[PDB]
Amino acid sequence: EVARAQAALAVNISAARGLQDVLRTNLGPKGTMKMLVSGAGDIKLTKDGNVLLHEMQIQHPTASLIAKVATAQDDITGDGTTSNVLIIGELLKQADLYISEGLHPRIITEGFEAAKEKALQFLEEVKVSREMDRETLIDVARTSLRTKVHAELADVLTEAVVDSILAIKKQDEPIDLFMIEIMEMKHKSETDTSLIRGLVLDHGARHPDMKKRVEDAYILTCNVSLEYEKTEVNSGFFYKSAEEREKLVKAERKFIEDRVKKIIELKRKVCGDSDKGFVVINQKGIDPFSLDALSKEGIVALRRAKRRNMERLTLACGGVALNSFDDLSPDCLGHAGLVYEYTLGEEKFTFIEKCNNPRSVTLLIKGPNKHTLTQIKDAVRDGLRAVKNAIDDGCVVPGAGAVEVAMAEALIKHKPSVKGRAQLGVQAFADALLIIPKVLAQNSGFDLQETLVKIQAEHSESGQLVGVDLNTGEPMVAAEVGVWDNYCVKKQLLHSCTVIATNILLVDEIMRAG
Template identity: 35%
Template sequence: MAQRMGNQPMIVLSEDSQRTSGKDAQSMNITAGKAVAESVRTTLGPKGMDKMLVDSSGGVVVTNDGVTILKEMDIDHPAANMIVEVSETQEDEVGDGTTTAVVIAGELLDQAEELIDSDIHPTTLAQGYRQAAEKAKEVLESKAIDVTAEDRNTLLKIASTAMTGKGAESSKDLLAELVVDAVLAVADEDGIDTENVSVEKVVGGSIDNSELVEGAVIDKERVDENMPYMVEDANVAVFDGALEIKETEIDAEVNVTDPDQLQQFLDQEEKQLKEMVDQLKAVGADAVFVGDGIDDMAQHYLAKEGILAVRRVKNSDLKRIARSTGARVVSSLDDIEADDLGFAGSVAQKDVGGDERIFVEDVEDAKAVTLFLRGGTQHVVDELERAIDDSLGVVRTTLQDGKVLPGGGAPETELALELRDFADSVGGREQLAIEAFADALEVIPRTLAENAGLDPIDSLVDLRSRHDAGEFGAGLDAYTGDVIDMEEEGVVEPLRVKTQAIESATEAAVMILRIDDVIAAGDLSGGQIDPDDGDDDMPPGGGMGGGMGGMGGMGGMGGAM
């Protein structure tokens, strides 16, 4: 890029740089965002389709989880990545609703494109979109339904709704029970941390064989065959150290001139190791979990004392064992006391799907639990884990906020009506942006209908008429095609799923719309979604604009989608 000063051109950017400005830049970025949204749109709802994602090394992921799809797609375009960030924010904040957030963001961009073509300034659009988003959140919060931790039935419905259409359909009632029990178990005065719910996947058996273990399950074995397989009514020690002789921190040489001296060294080491084991025995430990190694001689003495020991346990697992048994993690055996020990009715090594694991269970007040997920194939249990993660997130969010909304496109249809009324009270061109926002929200019920094989126009007309009549809970039953009361049917989701989706989608759309100049340091004309997929046959698109023309290659994902 060159600017002229008098008759002398002044070079500002390097020759390799590219610049796209004005409507070309806006159009390019809008196209990128819309392409990302379109790639996950068919996965929305209980009848959404799955995507098969094949990476460059041949690894396969089959899923309809929005955030997983977008992460696996390896998107390079900067504007497209802003939409991907919407799904990641949604996942981090709520745990579900990632596809909803991305689809709304894409539709907001689509509606904006039409207004920009009609010479509505992007700043006006941004202002109108923000006003609409604030109003939408107010409306949803005023109409939300209150829920408490005692309302188990509603919590089960929320857990079940989050899993619908994600490979767990046949067993969602059982899994919903397990999820609600798990979240309620780990709740304490500090809140709810779902990190304390460990999910273990086992290939083999059916989904119905999945179970909740109130306690910790460690993917380890006891260190010595002579140790007991099972210890009942066990006092549990958790030691974040090593049952080994520490090496000196400085290099030193010891000259041995007599075999007796060597034996004295060995005897001294053995004595130190025995003292360590004696310390554990003295405080009454029946099982010990060690963060580092255990010397062979220490293993011998532990087995001799009938103590079950496990070594090289991950720090996160040590914390979960301590949390579930009530033990304290100690870093020095010199300071260990009986009060530092936890209690478990059973510490045992068991075979699960051909793998040996240590079960720490039958605890008095499990504040850390383990969900065992079973399935016929690896793909099944992987998708099941994603469904469970979503479900854990929405149950946690519901207990934190105490507010839920009906599903089935009911909130979006209501918001569209409310925002059109609100637009009439807003002066200036922002009114057009608010109306566009209302139209954009209706993409959710419309997509639910399309994915269920229903007529989207008929479904939308039915939904609008029921909401006009004051039925806030009226939503689309994707199985029958009828408009029903979603609250009565038990299809509900946390308030924050919707408010966060609207907020994130709006911010991303506004940020993209406000960009009128794209200056790239290098050549982006080969804008493939997956640069490693070996498909370099895309025609050059004429600079950066053409690079995003290649966003059409997104649907291909190297032939995977």
């Protein structure tokens, strides 16, 4: 099967319409929630420009490419992937009309280029070098969370967000590879979310109150078996020779009492007293008669620890894995400043904070253990990836449409490349910019024409970056509202839109192959 002269372009642009149309109410606080039950046949609550692409069982080849293109944007920005979907179908709308008038796509693609770098010239003009103060970091974190979840949930979470990124400035890191551990607490209300500087251990040491308050924690993150499986083999599994299998039994019970006695020599090796604590995090279960005997020695011994916690506790606190408890100095182990066993739900959740090195900060959300807990998981994830860009750049800009009409004023009125061939592509380019402020306010009730004439005048009047209030439908100045975008984010959505627009525009045949 082949796709000829008109149809190969037409399927590409028509699919970009309804993709943009369904993904309309997903950006900003006007952006509505979405569910998939047709991506995996499960009750799923999902919101992102990229994540909704990855879950839906799409067969149109353009949206499959955009899921690849916005992935490169989602690796840096997160949110803004749903910003990229809106501008593509609008950009394809104006240029198709010129092709509907009869025009080469390449001369418009030629006009797509010089229109872009004038906007890229305008991005240096419109960037606003603000400080990376916490309240300035709050306003970025407010508009990132209210895009995905409620504002009442956002402001509780915004308290926990902006403090961890100030902790990664202690490590002088502009990006976020650690301090991004999302831990989830068994609750029924997701209204609560706690911030722990160190880690959160998810277990509670079957005989409790061994040592629940440890002021001097010398951590051992190991996985030593004390409930050891005892097998008699002659073939690698159970065999028929009853004479042979009997002689191995006498050494099997000598392994359990071996690992109990090794704990006693290690406590006197590290601490020397009971005033200084000692914490054993075992990835496996521990004997409760050992948990009675270790509790009297001044040892708390946490059991059945998660294997994901096993590496991260070694990074921030410390403590390496063994299968013995041999005499080790505190140099071989790590340290934590404070250990407290917290309880909420059917499991005890031991808090472990103020590490040997506070390198990873655990974001502990509470919730009803639903997809709502999953929906607040990726919301704060994209909340952290947005303010990741804030530590990257120096210029935090009022967004939400403030730059969008400000570009299109300079593009249409001032021909950058006054030769008429490229200004045709400028007209499609500047009209592509209008789609984000005009339709979200039109969704809010004040239609698109009242919003555009207000924000074009006021920005041309003031020069102050008036944005759009997505909760009234009328333009309000985003500098005081706190709906802001980064200099890192706004470049890439301009970058990722243009390159993926031109190549699908410059096709003429889509042939079945392979």
